[PDB]
Structure 1
Amino acid sequence: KTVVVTTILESPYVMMKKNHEMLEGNERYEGYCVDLAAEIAKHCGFKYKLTIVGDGKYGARDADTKIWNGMVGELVYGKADIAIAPLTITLVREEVIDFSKPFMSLGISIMIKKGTPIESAEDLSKQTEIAYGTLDSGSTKEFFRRSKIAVFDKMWTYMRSAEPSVFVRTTAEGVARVRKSKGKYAYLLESTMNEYIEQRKPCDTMKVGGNLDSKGYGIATPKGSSLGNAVNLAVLKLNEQGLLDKLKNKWWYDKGEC
């Protein structure tokens, strides 16, 4: 009956409300995806329960145990009925789960501490003083591990062998590493997260260069789910009406601190 929604604590998509300990259920959270979940649920006619993914990961298949972790795993093993999060539509995921059309368009980008003498991925590749990495588990890391493009393959060769590790467990961790590294660490992450952080105090980071690729985030459901069709139609309707743009403005720029 009640649809179990798996999501992730990733700002500004889902965050704990300041007074969450005094609130119950869905009311404990706020964010772009919290607002989107309420709308998808109204338009599809279902009751739901927001739940934060237990391992705090997006979703990758372990080469070895072949088990899917993160939000993708929750859907694959039937622990959740739908994922409403900044989950990237990728070929490997689409093979095991269904995705609505994109509710957000984006691409991999570079985040630097202001003043870092880096303007592009080519710049990062040709040097070694400034370290750089990605989220330890996700579509960004996979983009690099599989690129057949020279500059990106060179970047992957470096990243996968860098010691100490240049990979981070969460986006917040990558952001803090950039902030505390005096310009010696650049972070590769999705343009959406980059743009958000650029509008957050202490306003010491910046998005540089163009996006490395083009892709989108989709609402995911277990392969063959009853919800897929309606959820997809809802995403298309909300985009055409302008709600998605409204929500991005609300969470990225209307409340910007810089």
Structure 2
Amino acid sequence: WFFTLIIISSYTANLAAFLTVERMVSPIESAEDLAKQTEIAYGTLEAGSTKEFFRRSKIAVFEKMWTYMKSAEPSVFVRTTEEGMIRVRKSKGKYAYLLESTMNEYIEQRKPCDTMKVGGNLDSKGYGIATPKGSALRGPVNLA
């Protein structure tokens, strides 16, 4: 009887523990979230504007992320976007890639469909239509 009482209470209590923590688990929904934690690694292209954004950033979160990324072995940085994508895919949720939102959304719709974009943007950029300086097309193209 005593053994039974301990064992059954243990089963109930441990099942409650399982279900309660499964209910406390918060995903990454933001950049600061990725910054403060340490369990998940993350990197960017070795050469490109994203790396520069991080290197020159005077914002606390991004400075911290840069300090982490620089002081990381093996290197978080990747050679090409395909390399980063594959590293994310094969990391088993221990590597996050940091890239332009548009490419992120595109890759999200390409099989294998095992990637997703989390949170909002860290930065604001635009793509534009360019014309040579002093061109006559400029005003019409802008209005178009």
TM-score bin, normalised by smaller chain: 0.7 to 0.9
Instruction: From the two aligned structures, give the one with the greater helix fraction.
Output: 2
Matches within 5 A, 1:146-225: 146-218=56-128
Query: 105, 127, 144: which one pairs with 2:54?
Result: 144
TM-score normalised by L of structure 1: 0.42
Q: How many residues align?
A: 119
Any gaps of 5 or more consecutive residues in structure 2? 1-25
SS of the residue corresponding to residue 187 of structure 1 reads strand
Are residues 189 and 232 of structure 1, via their aligned partners in 2, closer, same or farther at CA, if it must alter by over 3 Å?
A: farther
Any gaps of 5 or more consecutive residues in structure 1? 1-115, 222-226, 242-258
The corresponding residue for 1:233 is 138
How far did residue 147 of structure 1 move?
1.0
How far did residue 141 of structure 1 move?
0.4
TM-score normalised by L of structure 2: 0.73
SS of the residue corresponding to residue 132 of structure 1 reads strand
Equivalent-residue separation in structure 1 for 2:136 and 2:50 (angstroms): 26
Question: What RMSD, in angstroms, separates the aligned Cα atoms of the two structures?
Answer: 2.4
Are residues 190 and 231 of structure 1, via their aligned partners in 2, closer, same or farther at CA, if it must alter by over 3 Å?
A: farther
Aligned AA (1:182)? K
Matches within 5 A, 1:59-208: 117-208=27-118
Which one scores higher on RCO, CA 8 angstroms, separation ≥ 6?
Answer: 1
SS of the residue corresponding to residue 125 of structure 1 reads helix
Equivalent-residue separation in structure 1 for 2:109 and 2:63 (angstroms): 31
Aligned AA (2:138)? L
Are residues 118 and 218 of structure 1, via their aligned partners in 2, closer, same or farther at CA, if it must alter by over 3 Å?
A: same
How far did residue 230 of structure 1 move?
3.7
Equivalent-residue separation in structure 2 for 1:204 and 1:215 (angstroms): 26
How far did residue 172 of structure 1 move?
1.2
Equivalent-residue separation in structure 1 for 2:34 and 2:74 (angstroms): 17
SS of the residue corresponding to residue 158 of structure 1 reads helix
Equivalent-residue separation in structure 2 for 1:161 and 1:220 (angstroms): 38
